[PDB]
Amino acid sequence: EAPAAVVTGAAKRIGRAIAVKLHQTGYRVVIHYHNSAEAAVSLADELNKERSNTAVVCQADLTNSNVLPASCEEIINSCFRAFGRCDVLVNNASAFYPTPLVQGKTVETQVAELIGTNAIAPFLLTMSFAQRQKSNLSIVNLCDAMVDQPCMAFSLYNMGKHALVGLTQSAALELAPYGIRVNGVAPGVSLLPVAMGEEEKDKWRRKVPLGRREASAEQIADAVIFLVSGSAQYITGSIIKVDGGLSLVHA
Amino acid sequence: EAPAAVVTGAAKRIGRAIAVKLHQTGYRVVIHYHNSAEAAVSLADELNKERSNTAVVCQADLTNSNVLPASCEEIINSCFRAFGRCDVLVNNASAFYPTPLVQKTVETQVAELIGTNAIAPFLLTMSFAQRQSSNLSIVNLCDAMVDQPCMAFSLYNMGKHALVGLTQSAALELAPYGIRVNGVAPGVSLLPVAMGEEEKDKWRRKVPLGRREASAEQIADAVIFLVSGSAQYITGSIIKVDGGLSLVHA
Amino acid sequence: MEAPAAVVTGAAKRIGRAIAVKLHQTGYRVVIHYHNSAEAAVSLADELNKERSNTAVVCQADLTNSNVLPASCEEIINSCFRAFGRCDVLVNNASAFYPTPLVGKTVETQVAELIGTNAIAPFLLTMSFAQRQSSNLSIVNLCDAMVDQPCMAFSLYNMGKHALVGLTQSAALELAPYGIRVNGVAPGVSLLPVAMGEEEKDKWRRKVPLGRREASAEQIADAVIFLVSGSAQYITGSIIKVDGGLSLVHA
Amino acid sequence: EAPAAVVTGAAKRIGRAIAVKLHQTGYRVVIHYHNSAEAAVSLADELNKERSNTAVVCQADLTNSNVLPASCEEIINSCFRAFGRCDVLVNNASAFYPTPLVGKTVETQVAELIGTNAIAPFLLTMSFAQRQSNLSIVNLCDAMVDQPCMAFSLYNMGKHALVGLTQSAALELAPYGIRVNGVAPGVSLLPVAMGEEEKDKWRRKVPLGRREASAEQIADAVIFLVSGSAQYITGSIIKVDGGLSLVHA
Ligand SMILES: NC(=O)c1ccc[n+]([C@@H]2O[C@H](COP(=O)([O-])OP(=O)(O)OC[C@H]3O[C@@H](n4cnc5c(N)ncnc54)[C@H](OP(=O)(O)O)[C@@H]3O)[C@@H](O)[C@H]2O)c1
Ligand SMILES: NC(=O)c1ccc[n+]([C@@H]2O[C@H](COP(=O)([O-])OP(=O)(O)OC[C@H]3O[C@@H](n4cnc5c(N)ncnc54)[C@H](OP(=O)(O)O)[C@@H]3O)[C@@H](O)[C@H]2O)c1
Ligand SMILES: NC(=O)c1ccc[n+]([C@@H]2O[C@H](COP(=O)([O-])OP(=O)(O)OC[C@H]3O[C@@H](n4cnc5c(N)ncnc54)[C@H](OP(=O)(O)O)[C@@H]3O)[C@@H](O)[C@H]2O)c1
Ligand SMILES: NC(=O)c1ccc[n+]([C@@H]2O[C@H](COP(=O)([O-])OP(=O)(O)OC[C@H]3O[C@@H](n4cnc5c(N)ncnc54)[C@H](OP(=O)(O)O)[C@@H]3O)[C@@H](O)[C@H]2O)c1
Ligand SMILES: N#Cc1ccc(COc2ccc3nc(N)sc3c2)cc1
Ligand SMILES: N#Cc1ccc(COc2ccc3nc(N)sc3c2)cc1
Numbered sequence A: 001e002a003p004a005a006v007v008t009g010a011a012k013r014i015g016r017a018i019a020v021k022l023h024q025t026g027y028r029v030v031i032h033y034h035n036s037a038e039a040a041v042s043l044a045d046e047l048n049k050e051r052s053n054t055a056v057v058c059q060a061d062l063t064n065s066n067v068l069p070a071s072c073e074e075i076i077n078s079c080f081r082a083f084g085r086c087d088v089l090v091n092n093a094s095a096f097y098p099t100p101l102v103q104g105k106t107v108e109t110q111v112a113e114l115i116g117t118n119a120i121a122p123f124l125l126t127m128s129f130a131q132r133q134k135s136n137l138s139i140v141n142l143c144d145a146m147v148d149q150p151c152m153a154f155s156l157y158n159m160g161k162h163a164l165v166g167l168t169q170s171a172a173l174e175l176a177p178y179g180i181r182v183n184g185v186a187p188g189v190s191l192l193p194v195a196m197g198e199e200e201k202d203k204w205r206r207k208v209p210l211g212r213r214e215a216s217a218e219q220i221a222d223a224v225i226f227l228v229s230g231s232a233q234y235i236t237g238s239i240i241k242v243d244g245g246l247s248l249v250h251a
Numbered sequence B: 001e002a003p004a005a006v007v008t009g010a011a012k013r014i015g016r017a018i019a020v021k022l023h024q025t026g027y028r029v030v031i032h033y034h035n036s037a038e039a040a041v042s043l044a045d046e047l048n049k050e051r052s053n054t055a056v057v058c059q060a061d062l063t064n065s066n067v068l069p070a071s072c073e074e075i076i077n078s079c080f081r082a083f084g085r086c087d088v089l090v091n092n093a094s095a096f097y098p099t100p101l102v103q104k105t106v107e108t109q110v111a112e113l114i115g116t117n118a119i120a121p122f123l124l125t126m127s128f129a130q131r132q133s134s135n136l137s138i139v140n141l142c143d144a145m146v147d148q149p150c151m152a153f154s155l156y157n158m159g160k161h162a163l164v165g166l167t168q169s170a171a172l173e174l175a176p177y178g179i180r181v182n183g184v185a186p187g188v189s190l191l192p193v194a195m196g197e198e199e200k201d202k203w204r205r206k207v208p209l210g211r212r213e214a215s216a217e218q219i220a221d222a223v224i225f226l227v228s229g230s231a232q233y234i235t236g237s238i239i240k241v242d243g244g245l246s247l248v249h250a
Numbered sequence C: 001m002e003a004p005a006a007v008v009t010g011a012a013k014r015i016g017r018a019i020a021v022k023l024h025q026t027g028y029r030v031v032i033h034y035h036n037s038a039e040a041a042v043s044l045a046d047e048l049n050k051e052r053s054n055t056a057v058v059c060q061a062d063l064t065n066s067n068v069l070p071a072s073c074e075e076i077i078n079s080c081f082r083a084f085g086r087c088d089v090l091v092n093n094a095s096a097f098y099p100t101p102l103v104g105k106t107v108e109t110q111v112a113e114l115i116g117t118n119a120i121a122p123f124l125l126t127m128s129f130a131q132r133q134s135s136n137l138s139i140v141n142l143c144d145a146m147v148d149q150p151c152m153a154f155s156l157y158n159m160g161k162h163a164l165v166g167l168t169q170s171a172a173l174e175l176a177p178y179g180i181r182v183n184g185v186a187p188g189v190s191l192l193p194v195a196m197g198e199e200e201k202d203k204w205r206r207k208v209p210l211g212r213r214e215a216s217a218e219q220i221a222d223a224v225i226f227l228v229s230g231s232a233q234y235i236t237g238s239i240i241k242v243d244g245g246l247s248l249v250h251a
Numbered sequence D: 001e002a003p004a005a006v007v008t009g010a011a012k013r014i015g016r017a018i019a020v021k022l023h024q025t026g027y028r029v030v031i032h033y034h035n036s037a038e039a040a041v042s043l044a045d046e047l048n049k050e051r052s053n054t055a056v057v058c059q060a061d062l063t064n065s066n067v068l069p070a071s072c073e074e075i076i077n078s079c080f081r082a083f084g085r086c087d088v089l090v091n092n093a094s095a096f097y098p099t100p101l102v103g104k105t106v107e108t109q110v111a112e113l114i115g116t117n118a119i120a121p122f123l124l125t126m127s128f129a130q131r132q133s134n135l136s137i138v139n140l141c142d143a144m145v146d147q148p149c150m151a152f153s154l155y156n157m158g159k160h161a162l163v164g165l166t167q168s169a170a171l172e173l174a175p176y177g178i179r180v181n182g183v184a185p186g187v188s189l190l191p192v193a194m195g196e197e198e199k200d201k202w203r204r205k206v207p208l209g210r211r212e213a214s215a216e217q218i219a220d221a222v223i224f225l226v227s228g229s230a231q232y233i234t235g236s237i238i239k240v241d242g243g244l245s246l247v248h249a
């Protein structure tokens, strides 16, 4: 039988790219989404049209709350209900916005969203993935190559991505005896925010030593693909930067 | 006249050592506590006998909840009330226990481990900075074993990693205000009181420098260094005080 | 002549051999550099030339730091151009590894050997490779996942490996404008020293979370193959730990 | 009774400020120098005036060669000759200049940059440790080591190796009671050769005060690491960079 993978925030962008690429590699996929109903279903359609019964959608808010554990438990349940297995979990879903330290959302909403999506939901999804296990099991977390050179006023987001590095190492150590590898893919600049203007986009592009451009979503997916593959069978607790040398450029 | 410092979880162990050493260096201090009122008051009394009206206590739960921002705002407010200023914030308070991935509700554990170790320090940081010549700085109590974590301590580990991220981000963001932001990262200092004595010796014997844990005062020394005029260009730095423990391979 | 060409240093045995083999299996013509192991280097070349004619040469050079090291490194790179008309890939694999405690070989020889092979020779090879430059040009340095938790009394080895991390980062930055990518593979415990007793080998094996075993040479080679591939074309300045979680294990 | 310290490249700039501050703290100092003879003897005068018999100079070229071990051995020897002890070693001496991947031979470039920045520190560390209370070594590392300057590969390689040494020697020498630590400046006293527009360019990058570190600010970290207040600190590198290493492209 074909292996099965969960991709969080899979409706668009990097998540979609990962889902698609895992699909073309022969995975059945759970397209998790939050607000992107249209894009999620539309992607699952495209995928099923290619090989029938290979894609499902799973809606979940991944903001931290007392129900997040059940929501994460359910996401993994959705893989097992659809496919009888869960071989790969990609923690791709991410909230990303400034939270300036010196002063819309309450700060507790901000904490719930930025730490929730970026770290707490991956932790809970990992617990659920690991516990539901009865092959090549792995977890890939979408980290950030710029964690130690953070953007001004993104403290909560930065905190969550650091926590995610924390989890990747802690989970790799813990889940290694169960044969579950846990690794990271750290984009520098990939697909820029939809909201971002071209002039600003180019400001970021010009910083990238390797070709003065952002990563395509497929280039990110490539590293994900490598990590879940048999070519990475001994790789655990490793974070592969996919950043064109961005994190190496001094101020 | 004298600078003032907040130390969270300052009733016992490392926070106590930090509070004392700060006071010995001439700081007025807020001794924050959650459960340890008796110990907190005892410390304040001891320091006030040395210098009158130089130590105050302040109760707060630093677990993450909808009231944590108010609590943290109050911790900082209590320093400005007592002393008319807040020059130092030491984020020492920390919940610490294992949270296995394969098995208190996990969300309590989250609120406690991430709350104390990362969220409350972020909010305290905010309130500290909002309320602002001077030598303003923040010291965050990190963990030197963060990249070699203990088995089944994922949430603790995530919270400390988050604290490393806050150190860095706040150092950048607050540098234009002259607020320095730094970390001290113990390896093995005072062991958890609940831990078995043999389990303590195992940890002690692993330390390259003297096969013993750091005393609390040794941790406090790094903190004292970081808040001083001797560290006025230092921001975004985390100083390991671990006797080389983080350098020892499996 | 449309086939790409790779230089692998210390390619005669163990990890570099597996890398030469895997590169060859990928469609690379290979320069098999060696120092002492002439017989093994030639028999690799022969085995590879049996598979495809005129796709493997050998190149002898001592990689010890000396006045002639720069000429030697230039020759190694030239040899690839003379054999195959191109040089697409450099794999800095060769390494001396022995203790140099702080408290028949002189310390200066120890320096020349451990720093020469592990750092200087990679720097000069890098320089010659770049000076000489559809194309996908990259360098892969064989680092060490344990550089921040070093073995007792291996300071010079450790120092050369750390220097290699520096080169990887510095060369990635410098060579990104030429479209030369520069990455590391960092093994933990891989193919253990040839004579080392199985009781002692098991002490290292038991430390690894993922399977309580060392990496095969082929597993290290897998990460090298990924880094040189079309799948890694935005990856530069990255070091991929291939260590089975070994770096994550506390004392 | 008074402890003794070796500082390499102590005639000028950061080395000088380390020597000055160690002296003020109560150390006898060996002022190692290579070319800066006048400034070295001049510093030892200033120090010796202040407390006689507390400063010597020691000349050595710290470029890698077959004789570098004997020169490093000599530098430590000259501390024991003058003062009967050697409590502190400060690895400050550094070559620093571009070596692009694409006036000196590359073999000289290697010998200088890897010699001064890494090999001489290793050899000095060896000799220091061989001759053996609060014993320690401080290495002058670099906070920009993972965000290197363009075309400084050899220099960066040496500072990377220095981190390696700091860690490996900290581990190895800890059972002897010798601690080994690093101080990593970002932008401190900018190279003399550099023009003033370029200096200001670098100044503007520093989040904390938009200025370089004084040599005294760097020396303060060295002072802390050698002091009683750092007795459990080994294998730590303290960035003294005003938050520069935190600034993205
Ligand atoms: N793009 C880059 O340049 C870049 C750079 C560095 C790191 N990364 C990392 O790479 C990963 C993918 O990047 P990306 O730009 O493709 O991500 P993105 O488009 O900004 O967001 C990914 C998806 O996460 C889901 N999400 C957001 N908030 C959520 C919440 N509260 N609950 C549940 N789901 C939520 C969204 O799903 P719906 O659309 O269904 O609501 C969203 O489409 C992320 O983890 C990111 O942090 C990306
Ligand atoms: N001890 C070590 O070896 C070691 C190693 C690595 C890192 N560290 C770091 O060093 C720092 C201090 O260490 P320590 O051993 O002194 O830690 P500890 O005794 O375990 O710290 C607990 C202190 O923080 C307060 N605290 C705990 N949970 C809290 C909550 N939910 N809300 C509010 N306050 C809470 C406590 O206050 P009350 O008693 O008043 O309730 C207590 O005084 C910590 O940040 C720790 O992570 C220590
Ligand atoms: N194996 C592991 O467990 C492990 C762990 C961490 C890192 N690594 C890294 O992975 C790489 C390959 O590992 P390995 O175990 O296969 O390495 P290795 O067997 O120790 O050495 C590989 C080759 O390096 C060459 N070499 C040694 N000294 C030399 C000199 N002075 N001049 C020129 N060549 C010299 C030798 O060539 P000849 O035999 O032809 O003389 C040797 O066969 C190394 O860079 C190593 O540091 C390996
Ligand atoms: N300045 C900064 O902004 C900065 C930033 C990051 C790191 N650092 C590090 O901090 C330390 C001190 O900085 P600095 O600017 O004061 O250093 P520097 O002035 O550039 O050099 C210090 C001394 O090193 C000695 N030296 C150079 N080549 C030598 C050789 N071949 N043999 C023996 N000695 C040699 C010279 O001594 P003589 O004059 O006696 O010949 C020189 O005065 C260095 O390790 C440096 O890499 C400095
Ligand atoms: N303002 C602003 C700004 C600054 C830097 C970036 C870099 O691109 C990123 C970085 C992280 C990140 N995380 C997501 N979930 S999307 C994204 C884009 C994007 C936006
Ligand atoms: N099991 C286990 C175990 C392993 C290592 C340690 C080291 O000591 C620490 C570490 C973190 C920490 N955080 C606190 N709030 S107390 C404490 C003690 C303590 C317990």
Ligand SMILES: N#Cc1ccc(COc2ccc3nc(N)sc3c2)cc1
Residues within 6 Å of the ligand: C095, C096, C097, C144, C151, C188, C189, C190, C191, C192, C193, C204
């Ligand atoms: N003492 C000791 C000791 C430490 C680590 C290992 C793991 O195997 C390695 C590590 C690095 C290394 N470098 C080479 N050129 S071979 C090799 C084997 C083997 C022995």
Ligand SMILES: N#Cc1ccc(COc2ccc3nc(N)sc3c2)cc1
Residues within 6 Å of the ligand: D094, D095, D096, D142, D149, D186, D187, D188, D189, D190, D191, D202
């Ligand atoms: N080109 C160029 C250039 C870029 C940045 C700097 C920063 O200042 C430093 C850094 C390292 C260093 N090492 C020395 N031995 S002096 C020195 C000055 C100095 C020069």
